[PDB]
Structure formats: C-alpha cells, structure tokens
RNA sequence: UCUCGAGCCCUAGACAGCCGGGAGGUGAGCUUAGAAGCAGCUACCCUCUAAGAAAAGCGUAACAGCUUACCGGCCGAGGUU
C-alpha cells in the first residue's frame, strides 16, 4: 500500500540518491520527530507492536545509506 | 548442561507465572 | 576387517532420515533500461519470534522456482572428529 521506506526517506531528506559507501559518506539527515511520522505511515507494512520498535525498522535502513540522525 | 537451555527454562517459567521438553521442564517447576 | 588412544556432542533427546517452519520492514543502496539472496560495488543493519543470511548452492533475460543455513515435531541411543 504505502510506498517503500527507501522512498519515504528521500522525501524528508531532500536528496534523491543514497551513498556509494554508507556510514562513511553521510548524505542525508533526520530528526527524531521526523522519524516518528514515518513510523506512523508504515504501521501496516511493519510487524512491530509499539511505535518504539516501528521506528527501529525505519532507523535500520537509514545509516546504511548515509542518513545521520540528531 | 548447555546454558541457553537453562536460560530458556527460566524465560518459560517467567511467562508461566505471569522445545516441548523445555516446556514440560518449566511446568514441573 | 580387527585392536588401542584423544577431543567433542547426547534422554534438557544427540547423528541421520521423514514432516512442518523457513516470516516481515525490503524487490536493502548503489550501479544499471533491469537486477528484486545470488552480474558488479558498499554495507550487511531491526521487527516479529520457537526459528529464518542485506543469503551458502543450483535456477531465471530479470522475476518464479528448488533447496542451504537457522527452528519446531516425529523417532530413541549412542554419535561425531
């Protein structure tokens, strides 16, 4: 239903591509609340019961693209 | 006497309060 | 084929075989018209959970498909280096 994570990130990031080599080349960034919103849009797609873990899954694709958090 | 087996028997007993062999072990407890 | 020694695993059920499970975020990013476990390059992270790799091997033009790891059951005595 709701579009894939890789895309939902590139929107609130402002960047279109990821990184040639992740965690070594920081491309995009993300605040905590911004990730809370993304955690809400993928409730059906994710298996996590709490919004706590729901975040962790999204937060699990970011750093592997060069998406730092603050 | 593997440790992970002991940690499971505990975890099971923990849910009982609040592998089939490991379930029975916990029931007995 | 016979004999002797060492280590490790095992009734909290080992070795094997058979059955069942092998799940989601996600067909990871990049690259590429496309690449979705599996052309290449980088990374290889978290959920549900009793398991389940950013996939060990075949397979596809690419998907699919077939299984490997891993978990559970049946079985029951030694097994393995």
């Amino acid at each position: 239903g709701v579009p894939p994570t890789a895309e939902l990130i590139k929107d609130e990031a402002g960047f279109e591509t990821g990184s040639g080599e992740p965690q070594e080349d920081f491309v995009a960034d993300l605040s905590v609340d911004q990730v809370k919103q993304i955690a809400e849009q993928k409730h059906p797609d994710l298996l996590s019961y709490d919004l706590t873990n729901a975040a962790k899954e999204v937060v699990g694709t970011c750093t592997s693209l060069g998406v730092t958090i603050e | 006497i593997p440790e992970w087996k002991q940690e499971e028997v505990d975890a099971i007993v923990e849910m009982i309060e609040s592998r089939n062999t490991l379930l029975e072990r916990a029931l007995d407890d």
Side-chain angles (χ1 to χ4, degrees):
Chain A
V2 187
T5 302
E7 296 177 13
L8 281 183
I9 296 174
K10 291 159 181 170
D11 302 338
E12 294 187 307
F15 306 77
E16 306 92 4
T17 327
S19 65
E21 296 178 282
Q23 199 163 54
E24 304 158 57
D25 301 303
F26 284 149
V27 190
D29 274 44
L30 249 158
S31 85
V32 184
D33 282 287
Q34 289 175 33
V35 179
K36 281 161 184 168
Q37 299 170 61
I38 296 185
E40 303 156 39
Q41 298 177 57
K42 271 206 175 62
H43 280 324
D45 294 347
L46 309 175
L47 297 167
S48 45
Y49 301 87
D50 301 297
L51 321 191
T52 304
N53 300 293
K56 300 174 182 179
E57 301 186 53
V58 182
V59 180
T61 313
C62 307
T63 314
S64 55
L65 307 176
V67 186
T68 317
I69 306 181
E70 317 161 318
Chain B
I1 323 182
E3 293 181 44
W4 69 270
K5 285 191 175 186
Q6 290 179 43
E7 291 178 37
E8 178 78 343
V9 170
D10 291 323
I12 299 177
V13 171
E14 208 172 285
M15 285 189 230
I16 292 183
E17 289 182 337
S18 62
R19 296 183 185 156
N20 298 190
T21 47
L22 296 186
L23 301 184
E24 298 171 68
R25 194 80 171 149
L27 301 177
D28 281 296
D29 301 355

